[PDB]
């Protein structure tokens, strides 16, 4: 509503302002009612799909795990490496960039001292053993799960983790809701990923790919900015270079799909017959 409520609860509220407040309040109450109605059924389906998975061995004996990197939406780093690789057994043994020097062995539970020693050396991506890549027939081994959450040590042989997992996912379901360019902030080296780029006549670096992802590598190894770069975007910089803060390095058109080229030559028409393939539509009020 374009005319806001200019009155607080210490002063009065007249009749219309209190009526608009009632719109908001009853919308919230009906949200909470039907929200609980969906949340309980979500907890039911999750504890009935898990239901059975018991920590039934002590070492599966594989290596392939998932790669834990800090998540980067394109602003501040939302979830760091300490809060993701806290207490989970490493897949491949992490070597510090003093290559052929082992920092952690390949079956070490990463508790808080090890996580601080990960944060000091600025470790890129601690590849770690996940439950989904296990090898235990009819159950899940103990090392691929991790720390016993709610306790300190490794998981005991036996605790039913499917049920505590399904309750931990469905329990905050009561709290949930129901119904142009690239601007940099920090400073560091510039990384490009999955790019097919070429040089324009202006001297810049233009792109011939939709799958281009720009990254900002910081001073110690990790990444603090990531940007999906569109098709045919124009960079003011290149790969491996150095920028400063507040410097927009890319620009494109979100309305137009550019069909930019690679080689320099004349333009001709092939299989373009007028009247059928191309039509004659004169732009009336502009001219071109």
């Amino acid at each position: 509503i374009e005319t806001p409520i200019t009155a607080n609860f210490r002063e009065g509220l007249n009749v219309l302002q209190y009526f608009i407040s009632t719109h908001g309040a009853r919308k919230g109450l009906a949200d909470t009612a039907l929200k609980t109605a969906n949340s309980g059924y979500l907890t039911r389906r999750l504890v009935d799909v898990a239901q059975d998975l018991v920590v039934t061995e002590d070492d599966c004996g594989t290596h392939e795990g998932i790669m834990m990197t800090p998540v980067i939406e394109g602003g501040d780093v939302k979830e760091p490496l300490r809060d993701r690789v806290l207490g989970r057994v490493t897949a491949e043994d992490v070597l510090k960039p003093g290559t052929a020097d082992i920092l952690v062995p390949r079956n070490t539970l990463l508790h808080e001292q090890w996580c601080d020693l990960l944060e000091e050396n600025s470790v890129d991506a601690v590849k770690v053993r996940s439950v989904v890549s296990c090898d235990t027939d009819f159950g899940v081994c103990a090392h691929c799960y991790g720390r016993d959450l709610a306790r300190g040590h490794i998981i005991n042989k036996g605790e039913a983790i499917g049920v505590i997992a399904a309750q931990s996912i469905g329990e905050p379901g009561t709290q949930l809701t129901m119904r142009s360019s690239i601007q940099v902030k920090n400073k560091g080296s510039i990384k490009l990923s999955n790019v097919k780029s070429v040089v324009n006549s202006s001297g810049k670096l233009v792109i011939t790919s939709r799958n281009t992802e720009l990254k900002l590598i910081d001073e110690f190894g990790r990444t603090k900015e990531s940007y999906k770069v569109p098709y045919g975007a124009v960079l003011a910089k290149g790969d491996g270079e150095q920028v400063a803060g507040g410097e927009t390095v890319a620009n494109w058109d979100p309305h137009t799909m550019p069909v930019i080229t690679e080689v320099s030559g004349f333009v001709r028409f092939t299989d373009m017959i007028d009247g059928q393939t191309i039509t004659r539509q004169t732009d009336e009020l502009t001219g071109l």
């Binding site: 959450l149 309750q167 931990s168 469905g170 329990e171």
Partner: protein, 251 residues
């Protein structure tokens, strides 16, 4: 079931079986005295439709009813869904040695103990008191002990303080969402009629004190007392299983 009015409002199953046996006896009599050529057919259609009303009512076109709009209950309506044997009687049961009342604060508690009334502690813990009476020799049979604890004489409160002492109970809030919703305490007898519950613990139950009601259960056997002391005690669960955050945050 009798309704104490001289009549039997019957269950739906006896109605269904009675319909099948009526229709089947009439079909036996009609096959007996010869069917009129292209006639021994309507009665078999009726029998097939009565059996299809008995095995799963409402799956075939329009269901039957006794009174008045509500369709009555077949066998598949006793196995399926809610109000059926899988979800109402076999996965969650009604349980003896249990009770329930309204909760309150009482901040003089240590966090491994809760207040619990003298009347609830006397009615939950009856056979323990019977055993201590005929083990100390204050009643000959079980009936004298029952009449002693019905009269509530002056000695059974000492028996009750000697059976509560190191014996946990399970407290339970009614919408149990996560596994911290069932915890185990060591009771303290309270003059009154409410369950005094430690305040910090109410961060885990999501329980205020505006009329909330909690239910207490008793572990009878010995292994269940050890599981409600070593696994489920209120001092052990200080960390949540969703993360590493403490659940004893002062509110």
């Amino acid at each position: 079931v009798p309704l104490d009015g001289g009549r039997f409002a019957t269950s739906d199953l006896n109605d269904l079986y009675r319909r099948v046996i009526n229709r089947n006896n009439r079909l036996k009599r009609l096959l007996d005295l010869a069917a009129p050529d292209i006639i021994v057919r309507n009665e078999k259609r009726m029998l097939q439709e009565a059996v299809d009303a008995l095995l799963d009512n409402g799956r075939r076109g329009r269901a039957i009813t006794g009174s008045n709009k509500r369709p009555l209950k077949s066998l598949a309506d006793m196995i399926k869904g809610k109000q059926g044997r899988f979800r109402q009687n076999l996965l969650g049961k009604r349980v003896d040695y249990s009770g329930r009342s309204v909760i309150t604060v009482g901040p003089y508690l240590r966090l491994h103990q809760c207040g619990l009334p003298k009347k609830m502690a006397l009615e939950l813990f009856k056979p323990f008191i019977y055993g201590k009476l005929e083990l100390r020799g204050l009643a000959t049979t079980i009936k004298a002990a029952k009449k002693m604890v019905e009269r509530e004489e002056a000695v059974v409160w000492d028996i009750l303080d000697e059976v509560i002492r190191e014996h946990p109970v399970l407290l339970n809030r009614a919408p149990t969402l996560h596994r911290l919703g069932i915890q185990a305490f060591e009771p303290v007898l309270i003059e009154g009629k409410a369950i005094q519950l430690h305040p910090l613990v109410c961060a885990a139950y999501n329980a205020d004190f505006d009329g909330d009601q909690m239910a207490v259960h008793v572990p009878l056997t010995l292994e269940a007392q050890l599981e409600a002391r070593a696994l489920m005690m209120s001092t052990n669960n200080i960390l949540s299983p969703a993360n590493g955050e403490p659940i004893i945050v002062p509110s």
